[PDB]
Amino acid sequence: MELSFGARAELPRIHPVASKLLRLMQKKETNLCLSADVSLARELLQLADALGPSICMLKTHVDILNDFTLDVMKELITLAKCHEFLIFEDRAFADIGNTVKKQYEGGIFKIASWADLVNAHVVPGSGVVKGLQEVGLPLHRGCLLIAEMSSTGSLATGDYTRAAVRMAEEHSEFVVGFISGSRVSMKPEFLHLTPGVQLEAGGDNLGQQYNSPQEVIGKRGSDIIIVGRGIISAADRLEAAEMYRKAAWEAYLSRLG
Amino acid sequence: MELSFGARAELPRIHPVASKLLRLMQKKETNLCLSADVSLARELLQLADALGPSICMLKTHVDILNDFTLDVMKELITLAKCHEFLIFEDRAFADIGNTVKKQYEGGIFKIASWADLVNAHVVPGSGVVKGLQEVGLPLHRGCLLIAEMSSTGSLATGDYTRAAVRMAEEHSEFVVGFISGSRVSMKPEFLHLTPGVQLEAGGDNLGQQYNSPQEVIGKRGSDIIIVGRGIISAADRLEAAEMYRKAAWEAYLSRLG
Ligand SMILES: O=c1cc(O)n([C@@H]2O[C@H](COP(=O)(O)O)[C@@H](O)[C@H]2O)c(=O)[nH]1
Ligand SMILES: O=c1cc(O)n([C@@H]2O[C@H](COP(=O)(O)O)[C@@H](O)[C@H]2O)c(=O)[nH]1
């Protein structure tokens, strides 16, 4: 009884951020999230403008931007609104609730002011979600819980993954899905976003492992592929993004029937 | 066959950063780490200057400082050198190796340029340590692995904790100890630093749980207490720091015999 992204956008328990995302995925025929892993604001913004039509989401690591300013994020928001994609800051919050609330709202980055989505590790227990929610609920934001990781020797397996799923399902007012390698929740209101994706087999020299869009979306049942170097290191990043988009989209359609 | 901090500083396999720390702990009769959880640079620096003589370490969350600049960290280093304490940035790195290396070296914060110590979660597998090491070894830095957490519902238990200890013991050129609630390694070259510490029983409203210095150092065998609000929210932060210092030090001495 698998539903399209557009039908999932209308589910009774859908979060507004998830709904917005699912609708634009359906409209634009994309379930690709660009991992914009660059150190220069100009490159970030040039990528966001050129690839915006091809992506449902742009994932940032703001803490690697050498020339971060809040005005850069204002410019990114303009592009996100123009091309219709969400902004996801991959901060992987992983401390006690009292601390992560400050890390989310404050400091130099003011992440909550510009990020539609953030993510959190579940290792601290559910206080990490409660802390983030105190800032994110008033700001109408969503959160993803890291249920599995793509890297060699990941401990996010077995009962750890099951604990992530329970924590999500128990904080559905704020948690809209997962970072995972596969479908981990049976509830269709939750999004599954999967990093560690390339067309070719391989990995990197620091524990990253790759699987293909057909494997991740088609066989493992995830929703969205997150792709960094597969696109960013390519000469023509637009064509690379289109190849990943078409791969992930067709894998999704075939799983739908 | 328990050894003093000063003797542990001389162990054959001791890391240089651990040795420096252990020597100043012995010299100053302090095993207190101040968790300087403030949002203003002026308050951070006033705390570091006044409390510097009472502490072996000052722990930062640079990402909650509203007015962070690299010049603030230069001023903090001057104080750390004057009063003899290490600087520990509690960044809790928790991503793939390729990403954390950039988060450690680069961006606005340039953490590796000023932090003696950082910490990492073990959930991504050992690539998190390998990535950090590529930056930290050339810069003569050390790392702490998060083996246990103080918060309600922590998943850093059982085999997860055992995996943290193995990962530390296998990367002893860079990893100098743990964030933990107790002694988790039997090897005396490793430091144990414990947050979730207050004199009085209690917790916070976002999953923090407190135990006393006597419990953590004396009964659970940890080395250093990490104390934030117990000191920071007190009217007289200097006297508060002295109370925590004397508590942790005497608990240590009594465990020594
Ligand atoms: O399990 C995970 C969780 C992540 O955040 N990531 C992130 O997703 C991206 C993967 O990038 P790449 O496609 O270049 O390997 C990185 O930004 C990394 O930080 C991951 O690779 N695996
Ligand atoms: O398990 C852990 C790991 C932490 O980093 N911390 C950190 O240690 C400090 C505890 O501060 P406090 O004493 O105010 O509760 C915080 O900065 C928090 O981020 C913790 O409390 N428990």
Swiss-Prot record, chains A, B:
Amino-acid positions noted as binding UMP in the UniProt annotation, renumbered to this chain: S35, D37, K59, T60, H61, D95, T99, S150, Q208, Q209, Y210, G228, R229
Listed pathway(s): Pyrimidine metabolism; UMP biosynthesis via de novo pathway; UMP from orotate: step 1/2; Pyrimidine metabolism; UMP biosynthesis via de novo pathway; UMP from orotate: step 2/2
Protein name: Uridine 5'-monophosphate synthase
Recorded GO CC terms: cytoplasm; cytosol; nucleus
The organism of origin for this protein: Homo sapiens
Subunit record text: Homodimer; dimerization is required for enzymatic activity.
Record disease entry: Orotic aciduria 1: A disorder of pyrimidine metabolism resulting in megaloblastic anemia and orotic acid crystalluria that is frequently associated with some degree of physical and intellectual disability. A minority of cases have additional features, particularly congenital malformations and immune deficiencies.
GO biological process: 'de novo' pyrimidine nucleobase biosynthetic process; 'de novo' UMP biosynthetic process; pyrimidine nucleobase biosynthetic process; UDP biosynthetic process; UMP biosynthetic process
Catalytic activity entry: orotidine 5'-phosphate + diphosphate = orotate + 5-phospho-alpha-D-ribose 1-diphosphate; orotidine 5'-phosphate + H(+) = UMP + CO2
Portion of the full-length sequence here: 224 to 479 of 480
Gene: UMPS
Record annotation: effect of changing G207R: In ORAC1; increased OPRT activity; reduced ODC activity; reduced OPRT and ODC activities
Task performed by this protein: Bifunctional enzyme catalyzing the last two steps of de novo pyrimidine biosynthesis, orotate phosphoribosyltransferase (OPRT), which converts orotate to orotidine-5'-monophosphate (OMP), and orotidine-5'-monophosphate decarboxylase (ODC), the terminal enzymatic reaction that decarboxylates OMP to uridine monophosphate (UMP).
Consequence of changing D90N: Loss of OMPdecase activity
